[PDB]
Amino acid sequence: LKLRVASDITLSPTYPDLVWENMGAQYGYTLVIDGTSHAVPATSGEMVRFRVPSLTPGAHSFGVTVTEGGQAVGQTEKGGTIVWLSATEDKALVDGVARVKAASTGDEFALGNYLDSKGVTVAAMDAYRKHFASHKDDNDMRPLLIKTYNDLKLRDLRQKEALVYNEQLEGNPGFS
């Protein structure tokens, strides 16, 4: 019940989703962004995912309270910072994504890597997950997915991904 969240994350109207660690299906969450409280349903999925409704462009502080039966049971110790993109920045991000998709057709890694470079860590995570789902053996790039999970503080996912990486190292002829 030591929930942590990303220290810094970029979101935008095109990529509005925030993610944090699922503390257990018994728990709901209250996501607080600059004093506005959002009631987040409990989930049994691999992570908690919440579409942030439109914020004003710029920096916003957020924290998360863990709740059980509507009662606070835990809380982020340090919050994080959301940077919400302006209309102009979001148009550029959207054009960059389009450029990368045109130039590297079907390449989910290239897409994830571009989004990652702009701080759009949840969208980078989605693209990377697609990449590794179809190129499970691309171990050299896997640390970027590991780092993404680590940045979002998705502890279990990070541990699992690290185990995949190690098992793939260990599969090398002669290694173990």
Side-chain angles (χ1 to χ4, degrees), residues 60-146:
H60 295 282
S61 80
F62 76 99
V64 179
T65 303
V66 188
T67 58
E68 192 175 0
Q71 301 224 281
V73 292
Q75 201 191 296
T76 44
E77 299 279 289
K78 310 190 200 255
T81 301
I82 285 157
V83 179
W84 188 275
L85 297 190
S86 70
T88 304
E89 293 173 285
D90 204 34
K91 180 178 332 107
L93 184 70
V94 164
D95 291 345
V97 167
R99 205 163 37 63
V100 172
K101 289 181 154 165
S104 319
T105 165
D107 180 349
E108 291 294 332
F109 174 80
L111 177 53
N113 200 48
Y114 178 75
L115 290 162
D116 199 356
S117 79
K118 306 295 183 183
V120 196
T121 314
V122 171
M125 186 201 62
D126 293 337
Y128 290 148
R129 287 163 55 96
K130 284 188 222 188
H131 177 69
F132 287 102
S134 62
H135 304 76
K136 162 180 148 60
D137 63 347
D138 192 12
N139 208 213
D140 286 339
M141 294 302 110
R142 181 166 274 109
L144 290 166
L145 178 59
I146 292 166

Side-chain angles (χ1 to χ4, degrees), residues 7 12 17 19 21 25 43 51 53-55 62 64 72 76 99 104 114 125 130 134 154 158-159 168 172 174:
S7 304
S12 76
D17 290 351
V19 154
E21 191 179 28
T43 175
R51 176 184 180 115
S54 291
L55 303 177
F62 76 99
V64 179
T76 44
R99 205 163 37 63
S104 319
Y114 178 75
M125 186 201 62
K130 284 188 222 188
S134 62
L154 300 173
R158 190 227 146 107
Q159 185 186 8
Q168 286 186 23
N172 209 256

Side-chain angles (χ1 to χ4, degrees), residues 3 11 16 18 20 27-42 48-56 60-67 70 82 84:
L3 175 62
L11 304 179
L18 192 55
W20 60 92
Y27 298 113
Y29 310 86
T30 300
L31 166 67
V32 188
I33 300 171
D34 295 334
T36 290
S37 159
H38 306 266
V40 180
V48 186
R49 189 158 188 138
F50 179 79
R51 176 184 180 115
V52 172
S54 291
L55 303 177
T56 54
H60 295 282
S61 80
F62 76 99
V64 179
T65 303
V66 188
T67 58
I82 285 157
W84 188 275

Side-chain angles (χ1 to χ4, degrees), residues 141-157:
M141 294 302 110
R142 181 166 274 109
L144 290 166
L145 178 59
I146 292 166
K147 204 129 66 139
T148 291
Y149 289 146
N150 190 243
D151 182 348
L152 293 168
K153 328 288 201 190
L154 300 173
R155 282 178 296 168
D156 286 3
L157 286 164

Side-chain angles (χ1 to χ4, degrees), residues 4-24:
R4 303 182 72 213
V5 294
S7 304
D8 298 282
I9 187 162
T10 299
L11 304 179
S12 76
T14 307
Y15 299 102
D17 290 351
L18 192 55
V19 154
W20 60 92
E21 191 179 28
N22 176 2
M23 292 293 88

